[PDB]
């Protein structure tokens, strides 16, 4: 039972990396070029876009992907320099669990579960409140849901292994 | 008879991957830049494009290509870790068959058999119904038909092998 | 006499692949951005471009290049799995001949021998007949002629070898 | 205690290089295309952009990354040519410390701790003072803070090792 | 004396290839985007550009570079298949000489020795004669002269070796 | 004393190549797109840009980098073919010195020590004298100074080694 | 009682003429210049304006004013030529009554009682139905009501006098 | 019976003059400013407008009005100079009849009975045939019909008087 | 004392008429051409202008001027037809008083005492609330105050005369 | 016979004045606003219009009309001051004849008999020769012919009277 | 001496009225259409024009002309009604003097002695201070000076007559 | 001889007034709308037009016409009030002579004898010197010459009469 867990964890990790690397960068290419607001004021588009999307999804996902694989690099470097291993194993497993749970919660609190098509903006220099229109909301919603599902699976597997070792 | 089946399956898979990888990404490059609607309303182009093409063909095809090759990766990882194999063989064959049939049916229900040149749009903020015009419909229709034919061939071969093993 | 034939065939094939790969993709880059028609109607440019150039030359050439090298891949895979070979040799030679002749005839019937500088278009929504102007006709004509010559040489060599074996 | 220091230093260095290389170049892509000032004067945008951002952040970071790894290259070349090593070791450690502290102080004095959204410009040919608007200030602020934190960690580790050797 | 000739020939060939490959493709990038004519007629820019520059310099140079190295590929393939060699050596030397002289003469007759800054155009649909303006004439003139000098050196060396063998 | 000279020369050469290769090509990307002159005359921008910047800095630097490493290639090819070496060593050292001094003097006479922000242009078809505005002058000035310093260091080291051998 | 009727009739007639002559012509001056429809189709504005306002109010009112005073001119010309008068008097009174009632009914059936601010148009070449926006609807509504009231008063007075004579 | 004929003729003449003078000049004010054709060719609007409307209606009507009152001026001048009168009376009546019939027939042959909303134009420099759109067709049709009716009434009355005198 | 009252009343009336007639019509000429709102929505300018200024000041003043002089016309017509006069005198004085007081109160309730420079508009099709900018507010405020003062003087004089007669 | 000559001369003169005064000024209103040339050069329209039409037809006709009636004014002033008359009569008749013949010949030599629709212009700052397009050529041709006919009639009558007096 | 004073006063008054009436209204026609400010802000032109020119010169001059002739109208009406005259004469002379002096002082305090070509504006919604440019400053300065001189002459003459009567 | 002088003077004066009044005002209508300069600077057109044409010709001519007829008005007013006359006659003749000579000299010194088609302008805010283009130079030159000739004739006649009286 615990034999297949490692295989499934590795396959899920590789799948997530490949999906993020091959396709993600071209959905978000024209995010700001195709953002439009109903106004004649110079500088309102910049402020309203910056308020609507403080950090892009793809930047967050790349950062998370790189950060969640650091314990393995530390373990490999330690083993290479050596050339209490179980203590290092346990510590790295715990750290991986904590990092993954933290990142999942942060994603939920940053983005939610959908991308709406309209936005209401009231930042200077825009006069009172204006309405702005988003590009490709449906595809971005699908991406959000898919990423959340994959991260949940990863968390479940890590908890399973942690409870297996005891 | 069953000897040539594996060779033909491998050749078809490689051919599909190469065709999708080398040429597909540049037909769909200007999909939204060359989309135009007859109107003066800001934000109508975004809504009508999003309603006409919820998910691009190329995204769907890349996802399908990556997803239909996961059982082989699982088998290879299992064999590497080992260094009832027939049980794994049978299970992976069954899973491949199911995944391919599901993806083919999903493609048919998502896209149909052609891409029309005109589109009729009635989404907010567009007033009543408007007419929009598509880029490169004929080439996209040819691509659709070619992909459907290749996927059908793959399904036929997988069913043949499944019935061969028994 | 038959010794040099194989060398010349290989050199011609490699030359064709290199020529298509290095230079072809940048002549056709701006095909639709620099296409213009004399009109004020929205959507007329899309329809007239789609009617004038249903499939781009470069797409056809890439498809042909990939398709005409499949018998070699099948032969290599068969030999690798084995690790009546002459029957496979004869069959693959025949198939290569048929594929090359078919593709040459298809090219002739699709494109002809030149690219004109003006086009007359009468497709909806354009009112009556309009005149449109093409980008880089002379270079494209040169490319067409060069490709036809190379394909003819390849056909001649394949027929020579087929008659040599008997 | 001193065993883990080298591992952590190497991991931090690799992390910084990867973060700068993979994501940084695409945040700053449209820095000058999306810079706008409220005026009708030709040439005012160029002058005001040049005054606001004399050197881009990414150029400075690439230069610093390349410059802080030169002592290692010198050491490797010396060892290769040889094929008082401790004297070279001490000297290169000292030089690395000095370079890192200098670069950190220079960053602080060049950029500060945030990127504001508005800029006030009074350079010829602009008449009196004008107001200009910046692109993506929040993301750039986050990047600044992250880079400062990483560089501080590196400085702390280098000082720790220097005091360890004595 | 004949020892250094081969070394100088190889170095010159590699230098020419590197110069053409690294820098040439970006001087000619905006050739047609920055071409302008003084007129209000739609379609006049296309016709006048096509008449002024039938084939780009870079296309011609790439074709020549690829074509002048085919005898070496034939010789290598012959030697590999073998695993009267002097007859092949002599024949390939003669063919190289002929190809290089032909290409040099063709370049001279196609392009001349300079690129002027103004062009006078009288092609339909332009009314009578119009004046058009070229991009980056000085750099292109420098490139032309440099390429001519290199090709002349190559021709001289090939003739030297041909006379050396006798 | 003469041991470290070779190491420092190699490190400086590699540093210069890396700096030119990684960052230089993107500072000069928009040189002509963001060049503007105060006028209504068609064709004046082309003439004034061509007069202000006959050859780009990056082209000159790439050419110099490639040209100053040819003696090493000649030496390596000679050694490979051999498989009076000191005569070749001395000759190549002398040639390297001459080439580097010539290129440094040429740079000084071509470009000077700074890039001004305004330019005064009086070339046909511009009427009398006009004023034009440059993009990113400060960064280009910094680049100029840095390159001059590096080249001076290289010249000093080469002269040192030449005097060392005697 | 019948003495004041003639005075009131004359005063009302003069008042109507003055009101129409002095102010009416400048409310309707920009009727078609400030008419706008939401579309990109050439020729749609003309068709939709022509369908919304077949005849301008001011043209109708001028025609009516001129036509309702013809019997007086006929009577004056008859009297001048003479230089059964009661028969002419009765006949002209009857004709005036009939003309005024006919014109009032025609106005009601042509225009109604208000001018709306939006219009829905479905005439060729407009595609399907479009929305258009009117200029100065409130003032035109006030004018309509005022004119109707005045005409009603005139009709009442004419009927009163007709019944008075018997 | 013949007494009322003169009165009715005078009243009709005055009515026609007043109608033409007060209202006609402002319907045709924007005839060429609001004329539009679907094309990008300079000079096509001028040619197509000139071909569609060689002479404006209002010019023709003013000319006719002035020309049909010349016999009265001649008669008055003759009487003033005198200060066979019946011969002059008869001659002027005949001339008036002839002029009025000629002008009515000319109007019918020049303009017809309606103004269409679309026009098809094939004059140089327009390429092939184009479609153009007219301003205020309905009002102009009403004007045409009204003028024809009035002129017919005038002709009938003149013939009546001519037959009365005998 | 009562002798000068009539003279002052006549002079004030003539002064008001002259002031309104000579200068008023050219202050309000460009009221709608120079009205601007900050928005990209078609049709918002029309709605917001119509809501801000339902009836122009000049139209109201012309109507009032014409309406307040009708009793004099009635009196003159009565006297002419006659060719209890005191009863008519008293009645016309009373009617003039009532009309003037009513018009003054109506002006106060319609317009107030100033014209502001900014307007806030929330009418369909404008999205939420927008800001619009007025032309020549100061001059229009001066006009308003001047007209109010003149009308007040007229009312005072009419009341004085009414109380004088008793 | 000579009695009717004076009447016909007066009627013709009055007719010419009325025709020129009422209609002529509005055909030529938009002469320069609707003049267009195919070019991008600033200032070419002004030069080409000034070269095509040095003096407008209407200016010439007004000048001629005023100048040909001066002898009558001189005669009237002489008679008024008096309050050899035949000598003045003869002299004024001769002067009128001379002035009319001179003006007719000048018209013929200035304008010819038609107005063409296209014009070829080669004046600075236009580059080489350009093509320009005229407004309302047919109506202007009709006007030219009509004016020539009227002037010819006037000349004939004046010569008739001159020969009558003897 | 006092005889010529009245004649000169009348001539000066008539001259001033004629000069103001015939030419003044067309210098100020395009005051706001040709007013321009260097900015991209909507609504800044309106505010800055309103602040620079609160009341137009021509409005002030028309008001003054009408107001300074009221005493004569009062005197004429008094004389007509009469059909102590010296008391009225003296009173009207005094009132004329006071009105003229007041208007001259008001002109000086409102406008000064020149119209500058540049204006500096700092009113909302303009950001900080902007620069605006005036139309026809020199002609307006000449007009100002001429009007001041004429008014001064009038004041001098009125004072002369007042002192003459005593 | 002196009898005809008065008649010719009156006729010339009336002719000049009529010519200036009927035609002059419409040649200069579009003087500033059709003035263009080759530049991108806001405010340069205003400054350059104001420098080229400080006072319009028509304003100067109207002022001169009004000013040269004041002595006659003074004489008429004196005669009317009277109802040494020769002293007034002589004085007014002298004053007329002086005024006419002064105005002619002023015209010559202000305008010269022709209007050129190009203008060179160097006023702030224009950068250095720019070129501007004038509207209708030939017609304005003709007008200048005609006016000068008429004024010269008037001066000659006035001097003749002055010498006649003695």
UniProtKB/Swiss-Prot annotation, chains A, B, C, D, E, F, G, H, I, J, K, L:
<dbReference type="GO" id="GO:0007267">
    <property type="term" value="P:cell-cell signaling"/>
</dbReference>
<comment type="subunit">
    <text>A connexon is composed of a hexamer of connexins.</text>
</comment>
<feature type="transmembrane region" description="Helical">
    <location>
        <begin position="58"/>
        <end position="80"/>
    </location>
</feature>
<keyword id="KW-0303">Gap junction</keyword>
<keyword id="KW-0472">Membrane</keyword>
<keyword id="KW-1133">Transmembrane helix</keyword>
<feature type="topological domain" description="Extracellular">
    <location>
        <begin position="111"/>
        <end position="142"/>
    </location>
</feature>
<comment type="similarity">
    <text>Belongs to the connexin family. Delta-type subfamily.</text>
</comment>
<feature type="transmembrane region" description="Helical">
    <location>
        <begin position="143"/>
        <end position="165"/>
    </location>
</feature>
<keyword id="KW-1003">Cell membrane</keyword>
<dbReference type="GO" id="GO:0007268">
    <property type="term" value="P:chemical synaptic transmission"/>
</dbReference>
<feature type="transmembrane region" description="Helical">
    <location>
        <begin position="88"/>
        <end position="110"/>
    </location>
</feature>
<dbReference type="GO" id="GO:0019228">
    <property type="term" value="P:neuronal action potential"/>
</dbReference>
<keyword id="KW-0965">Cell junction</keyword>
<dbReference type="GO" id="GO:0005922">
    <property type="term" value="C:connexin complex"/>
</dbReference>
<feature type="topological domain" description="Extracellular">
    <location>
        <begin position="25"/>
        <end position="57"/>
    </location>
</feature>
<dbReference type="GO" id="GO:0005243">
    <property type="term" value="F:gap junction channel activity"/>
</dbReference>
<protein>
    <recommendedName>
        <fullName>Gap junction delta-2 protein</fullName>
    </recommendedName>
</protein>
<dbReference type="GO" id="GO:0007601">
    <property type="term" value="P:visual perception"/>
</dbReference>
<keyword id="KW-0812">Transmembrane</keyword>
<comment type="function">
    <text>One gap junction consists of a cluster of closely packed pairs of transmembrane channels, the connexons, through which materials of low MW diffuse from one cell to a neighboring cell.</text>
</comment>
<dbReference type="GO" id="GO:0045202">
    <property type="term" value="C:synapse"/>
</dbReference>
<feature type="transmembrane region" description="Helical">
    <location>
        <begin position="2"/>
        <end position="24"/>
    </location>
</feature>
<dbReference type="GO" id="GO:0005886">
    <property type="term" value="C:plasma membrane"/>
</dbReference>
